[PDB]
Antibody, heavy 217, light 214 residues
Framework: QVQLQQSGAELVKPGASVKLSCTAS????????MHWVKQRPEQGLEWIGR????????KYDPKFQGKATITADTSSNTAYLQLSSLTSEDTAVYYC???????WGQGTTLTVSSASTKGPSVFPLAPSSKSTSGGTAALGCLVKDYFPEPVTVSWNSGALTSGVHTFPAVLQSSGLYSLSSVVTVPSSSLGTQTYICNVNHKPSNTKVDKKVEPKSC | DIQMTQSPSSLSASLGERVSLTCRAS??????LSWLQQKPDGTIKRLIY???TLDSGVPKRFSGSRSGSDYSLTISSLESEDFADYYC?????????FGGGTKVEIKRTVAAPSVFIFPPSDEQLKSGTASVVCLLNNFYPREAKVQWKVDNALQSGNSQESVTEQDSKDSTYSLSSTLTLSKADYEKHKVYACEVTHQGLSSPVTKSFNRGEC
């Protein structure tokens, strides 16, 4: 019933620097050590370093020597992680741990990208006669090149939810995201209705309704 | 540095069953080990320290044991919230090192994927790029291989994968693979194929289309 509260998500351009924070409540940080750990997308935990707030002494893993700098301020009972010369390799969720690992922060997501806000481009993934079996056809929408996350995808103004699979976004080398949203439906319905995906990207206020009609090949 | 070899990396089980995962330290760490759990939402909690001591609040179904340099975590009577990721952590020396992790997911019967291949839309082609997507719908287990072959030549580095979280209703996974080429390199070839290998298929299934016929 003690906690560590980390700062909000960051969107930073490469070559720049960021300072994340972790504020403790329920104890005085000078009494224990404060650690920072990294977790790249879909990967494991990697230790960065730790600090003794009582005297400011730090220890780092050699792999982060010229990348991370850790500090603490007992007056605010907060610890900081400053990451320099950001590259794509730095995109990850950063955790703060203290009280021997008993307590962990919720984590702070850092996304390194040089891209400016951009709405997505929406292309159809047309149901094909060749890609039809047992009375069902698969169709979808490719929402490509948008920044930043998140994007909302609906089908037939939300009246279609069953069988829908909207995949998690992939950050491309361009510093832009892309994802696919597919759905399997009765192939017969393709003769009485047109399927449309409703894509909405709030940061750029881009709303697109894309019709996905059959195109066999 | 002390290397922590955690195995298995994946574990499939059902409600009420017991499961165990182990970590092996490359050097003598004499029980200076902890077990952490990370839920699907990202939050992390320590369940055990000193190899076998449970922290306050942690359920009785969790236990840890030592056998030489092999440290194990056992979850008896699995419950719904236990479907998570686990990591061992050694605090014997700096730098601190973690195990590779172990995913505890829901056991289910085998389910072969429904494979579909989608050619790039003409609206995208005219803008300069071409994205060919291969869809693997509702399959189990998670293990699946997708190979892109353009004119039989195996592709590498020009595709990206994305996989859904185990489905709440049928416990299956779905995966999408996207091959990305420039309009120019796309037009240099004819047959685009997606070869899928999965336990539920007797032999790998290949789905293809011939550019130019579109």
């Amino acid at each position: 019933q003690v906690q560590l509260q980390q700062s909000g998500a960051e969107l930073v351009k490469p070559g720049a620097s960021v300072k994340l924070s972790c504020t403790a409540s329920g104890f005085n940080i000078k009494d224990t050590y404060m650690h920072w750990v990294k977790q790249r997308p879909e990967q494991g935990l990697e230790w960065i370093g730790r600090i003794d707030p009582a005297n400011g002494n730090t220890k780092y893993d050699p792999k982060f020597q010229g990348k991370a700098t850790i500090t603490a301020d007992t007056s605010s009972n907060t610890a900081y992680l400053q990451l320099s010369s950001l590259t794509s390799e730095d995109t990850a969720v950063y955790y703060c741990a203290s009280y021997y690992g008993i307590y962990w922060g919720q984590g702070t997501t850092l996304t390194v990208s040089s891209a400016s806000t951009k709405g997505p481009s929406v292309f159809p993934l047309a149901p094909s006669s060749k890609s039809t079996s047992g009375g069902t056809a698969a169709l979808g929408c490719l929402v490509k090149d948008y920044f930043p996350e998140p994007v909302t995808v609906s089908w037939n103004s939300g009246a279609l939810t069953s069988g829908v699979h909207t995949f998690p976004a992939v950050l491309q080398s361009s510093g832009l995201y892309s994802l696919s949203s597919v759905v399997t439906v009765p192939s017969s319905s393709l003769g009485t209705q047109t399927y449309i995906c409703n894509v909405n990207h709030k940061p750029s206020n881009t709303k697109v309704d894309k019709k996905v009609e059959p195109k066999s090949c | 540095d002390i290397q922590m070899t955690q195995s298995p990396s994946s574990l499939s089980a059902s409600l009420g069953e017991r499961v165990s995962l182990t970590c092996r330290a490359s050097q003598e760490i004499s029980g200076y080990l902890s077990w952490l759990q990370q839920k699907p939402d990202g939050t992390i909690k320590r369940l055990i320290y000193a190899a076998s001591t449970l922290d306050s609040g942690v359920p009785k179904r969790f236990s840890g044991s030592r056998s030489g340099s092999d440290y194990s975590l056992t979850i008896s009577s699995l419950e719904s919230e236990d479907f998570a990721d686990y990591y061992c952590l050694q605090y014997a020396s700096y730098p601190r090192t973690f195990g590779g992790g172990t995913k505890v997911e829901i056991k289910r019967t085998v389910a072969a994927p429904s494979v579909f291949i989608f050619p790039p839309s003409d609206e995208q082609l005219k803008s300069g790029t071409a994205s060919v997507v291969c869809l693997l719908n509702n399959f189990y287990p998670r293990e699946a291989k997708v190979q892109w072959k353009v004119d039989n030549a195996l592709q590498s580095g020009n595709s990206q994968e994305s996989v859904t979280e185990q489905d709440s209703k049928d416990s299956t996974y779905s995966l999408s693979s996207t091959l990305t080429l420039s309009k120019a390199d796309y037009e240099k070839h004819k047959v685009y194929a997606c070869e899928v290998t999965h336990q539920g298929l007797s032999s790998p299934v290949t789905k293809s289309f011939n550019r130019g016929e579109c």
